[PDB]
C-alpha cells in the first residue's frame, strides 16, 4: 500500500538516475 | 511534423495508455482492446523496470487485494504517494507498470470489467497531473531520447 508506493518510487528513482 | 512534441495532447496520452494496457495484458495471453516509437520505448522501459523490480521485491500483485468497490481508491492512493514529492520519467514508468499490474490482477481475479476503468483512471491522472510536467520536460520526445537505448 504505502509499502507498494515506496517500492515503486525508489525503483523509479533508480531507473531515472541510471538514464542520466 | 517536427515543430512540436510527439503525443502532445490528452488524446495522445489516452492512446498511449490503451496501447500499454493491451500489451501488458497480451503478455499474459489476455486479449483486450479499448507516437509509435513512444509506445515502443515505453514497452521496453516498463519491461526493464519490471525485471529490476522483481529482482528485489515480490510480485507486485501480492500487495493489492482488489475488489470492484475499493480498486479506484487503491489506485488513487498508490499514485498519489508515488508523485507526492515530485515527477520524473522513472516514476512515470512505475506508474504505467502499476496500472498494468492492476489490470492483470483484475483479469486474474475475474474482475475483467475493471480494466476499462483502470484505463480511464490512468488517462485522467496522466492528463491532470503528469502532462504539464511532460511538456515542461521535453515531451515524450525527451523520454524516447533518454530511455531509447536498451539498458
Asked if A11 and B49 come within 8 Å (Cβ–Cβ), the reply is yes
Q: Which of A10, A13, A17, A19 to mutate to test the interface with B (most CBs of B within 10 A)?
A: A19
Q: Are the beta carbons of B74 and B66 closer than 8 angstroms?
A: yes
Asked if A12 and B94 come within 8 Å (Cβ–Cβ), the reply is yes
**B110: region left, alpha or beta (phi > 0 left; psi from -120 to 50 alpha):** left
The CA-based diameter of chain A, rounded to the nearest angstrom, is: 29
Between A7, A15, A20, which is nearest B93 by CB? A15
Q: Closest Cα of chain A to B65: distance in Å?
A: 10
User: What residue spans define the domains of chain B?
Assistant: 1-151
Dihedral sign computed on CA atoms, order B66, B73, B30, B27: negative
Alpha helix ranges (H) inside B84-137 = 89-108, 114-125, 131-136
Phi, psi of B142 (to 5 degrees): -65, -40
Distances (CA, A) of A6 to B20, B34, B79, B103: 23, 30, 10, 20
Q: Are the beta carbons of B28 and B107 closer than 8 angstroms?
A: yes
- Distance from chain centroid for Cα B20: 7
Residue B151 DSSP SS3: coil
| Chain A residues closer than 8 Å to B88 by CB | 12-13, 16
DSSP letter at B148 equals: -
Instruction: Provide CB contacts within 8 A for B104, sequence distance 6+.
Output: B24, B25, B28, B30, B61
Instruction: Find the closest chain B residue to A12 by CA distance.
Output: B90
Residue B3 DSSP SS3: coil
Asked if A5 and B53 come within 8 Å (Cβ–Cβ), the reply is no
DSSP codes of every residue in B29-73? T------HHHHHHHHHHHHHHHHHHHHHS--GGGGT---TTTHHH
Method: X-ray
Q: Are the beta carbons of B36 and B83 closer than 8 angstroms?
A: no
Asked if B81 and A11 come within 8 Å (Cβ–Cβ), the reply is no
What whole-number distance in Å separates Cα of residue B144 and Cα of residue B39?
A: 9
| Chain A residues closer than 8 Å to B78 by CB | 1, 4-5, 8
Distances (CA, A) of B25 to B9, B20, B32: 25, 9, 7
C-alpha cell recorded at residue B60:
507486485
Q: Are the beta carbons of B107 and B25 closer than 8 angstroms?
A: yes
Distances (CA, A) of B146 to A5, B79, B105: 24, 23, 30
Instruction: Provide CB contacts within 8 A for B140, sequence distance 6+.
Output: B5, B6, B7, B8, B16, B35, B38, B134
What residue has cell string 470489467? B113
Q: Closest Cα of chain B to A2: distance in Å?
A: 7
Amino acid at each position: 500500500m504505502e509499502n507498494l508506493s515506496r517500492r515503486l518510487k525508489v525503483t523509479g528513482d533508480l531507473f531515472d538516475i541510471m538514464s542520466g | 511534423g517536427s515543430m512540436a512534441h510527439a503525443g502532445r495532447t490528452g488524446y495522445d496520452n489516452r492512446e498511449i495508455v490503451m496501447k500499454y494496457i493491451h500489451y501488458k495484458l497480451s503478455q499474459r495471453g489476455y486479449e483486450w482492446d479499448a507516437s509509435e516509437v513512444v509506445h515502443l520505448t515505453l514497452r521496453q522501459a516498463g519491461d526493464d523496470f519490471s525485471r529490476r523490480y522483481r529482482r528485489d521485491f515480490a510480485e507486485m500483485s501480492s500487495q493489492l487485494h482488489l475488489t470492484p468497490f475499493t480498486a479506484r481508491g487503491r489506485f488513487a492512493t498508490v499514485v498519489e504517494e508515488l508523485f507526492r514529492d515530485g515527477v520524473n520519467w522513472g516514476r512515470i514508468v512505475a506508474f504505467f507498470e502499476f496500472g498494468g499490474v492492476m489490470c492483470v490482477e483484475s483479469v486474474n481475479r475475474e474482475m475483467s470489467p475493471l480494466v476499462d476503468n483502470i484505463a480511464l483512471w490512468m488517462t485522467e491522472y496522466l492528463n491532470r497531473h503528469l502532462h504539464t510536467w511532460i511538456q515542461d520536460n521535453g515531451g515524450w520526445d525527451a523520454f524516447v531520447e533518454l530511455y531509447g537505448p536498451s539498458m
